Amino acid sequence: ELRVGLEESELWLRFKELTNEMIVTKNGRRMFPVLKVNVSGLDPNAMYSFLLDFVAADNHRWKYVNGEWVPGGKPEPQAPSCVYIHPDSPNFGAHWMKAPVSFSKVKLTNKLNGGGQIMLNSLHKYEPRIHIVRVGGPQRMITSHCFPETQFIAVTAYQNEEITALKIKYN
Ligand SMILES: NC(=S)Nc1ccccc1OC(F)(F)F
């Protein structure tokens, strides 16, 4: 059975208990913490691509009101995010299983862009999700996994200074 684990879940949970925030810029900003996934149970000899996307966790615009994030009462259906391909893709199962798969180079933006960068809507809440795509073989297959621990709100600047301090402390 294909097993997918989050690496450093301890640390993600410290961000989640404050409500995590990720900066978006026009040029794109790398994530901290980095999503790192432990994968076992692949066919070491089969070929896979690792894809990352961001599900809109709800339809609401969020605002930091007097020290607390609060959703609005004007939600709308959210266009789904673009998919980032892990730059090691495509690769053998053995490649993916020898170390945590680290999405260190994805950049989060707020603007339609040259490509690579993933566009999010500022002040929306997102749940990172991966797709493991068995490629090249006769039988294509997809295993998907969500990481609730890694939920965040996309922001143009940090609102909660406890997040700012945690980001620096652990970077
Ligand atoms: N989920 C997506 S958008 N996958 C994808 C991305 C880039 C090229 C091809 C892709 O899918 C295909 F291989 F199944 F066609």
From Swiss-Prot:
Coiled-coil intervals, chain numbering: none
- Identify the tissues in which this protein is expressed: Detected in testis, but not in other, normal tissues. Detected in lung tumors (at protein level).
Major localization listed first in the record, in broad terms: nucleus
Q: Where in the cell is it found?
A: Nucleus
Name a single GO biological process: anterior/posterior axis specification, embryo
Instruction: Provide the Gene Ontology terms for cellular component.
Output: chromatin; nucleoplasm; nucleus
MF (Gene Ontology) = DNA-binding transcription factor activity; DNA-binding transcription factor activity, RNA polymerase II-specific; RNA polymerase II cis-regulatory region sequence-specific DNA binding; RNA polymerase II-specific DNA-binding transcription factor binding; sequence-specific double-stranded DNA binding; transcription corepressor activity
For the keyword Transcription, the answer is yes
Q: Which UniProt keywords apply?
A: Activator, Developmental protein, Disease variant, DNA-binding, Nucleus, Transcription, Transcription regulation
Q: Which residues bind DNA?
A: 11-171
Its annotated function is as follows: Involved in the transcriptional regulation of genes required for mesoderm formation and differentiation. Binds to a palindromic T site 5'-TTCACACCTAGGTGTGAA-3' DNA sequence and activates gene transcription when bound to such a site.
Disorder this protein is connected to according to its UniProt record? Neural tube defects: Congenital malformations of the central nervous system and adjacent structures related to defective neural tube closure during the first trimester of pregnancy. Failure of neural tube closure can occur at any level of the embryonic axis. Common NTD forms include anencephaly, myelomeningocele and spina bifida, which result from the failure of fusion in the cranial and spinal region of the neural tube. NTDs have a multifactorial etiology encompassing both genetic and environmental components.
- Quaternary organization: Monomer.
Protein name from the UniProt record: T-box transcription factor T
Q: What is the lineage of its organism?
A: Eukaryota, Metazoa, Chordata, Craniata, Vertebrata
Q: Which gene encodes it?
A: TBXT
What fragment of the whole protein does this chain represent? 41 to 211 of 435
